[PDB]
Amino acid sequence: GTSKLKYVLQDARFFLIKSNNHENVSLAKAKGVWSTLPVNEKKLNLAFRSARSVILIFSVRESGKFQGFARLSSESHHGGSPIHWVLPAGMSAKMLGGVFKIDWICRRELPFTKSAHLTNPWNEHKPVKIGRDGQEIELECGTQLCLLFPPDESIDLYQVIHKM
DSSP, X not given: OOHHHHHHHTTOEEEEEEESOHHHHHHHHHHTEEXXXXXXXXXXXXXXXXXXXXXXXXXXXXXXXXXXXXXXXXOOBSSSOOOOOOOOTTOOTTTTXXXXXXXXEEOOOEEGGGGTTOEXXXXXXXXXXXXXXXXXEOHHHHHHHHHHSOOOTTOOHHHHHHHO
């Protein structure tokens, strides 16, 4: 059902993560990690201490879809290992330093066509698909967006709930 999911999303904060390629989202799904540019790393660190759950909603650029969502389980930390991110043009390993651990809540896709009825007040009420990497999504918009995803029956939210 959706009851444990709603509990995890209660009073959560939500951030849109935009990835330049599928390879890094695949690595994040396999390893439970994410890294972002310093301006967003700072915001997520602040949010992690501020809210019972911080939810990252991932979308690969040009895919027309979201690829799932995950909860931060830690602030960013350095020196743990070199994650082999696929770096775009102008992106460097030092700008992708600082690794967050994440627990996936849903690894299923959601096409943007299905979220067209949701607008984000923190981005001028544009459709929630629209936004820069790191754009915060207001609570009600973000909750509704996450509830639109197909249920991911491979994930047991019991251990997620205990991290809270």
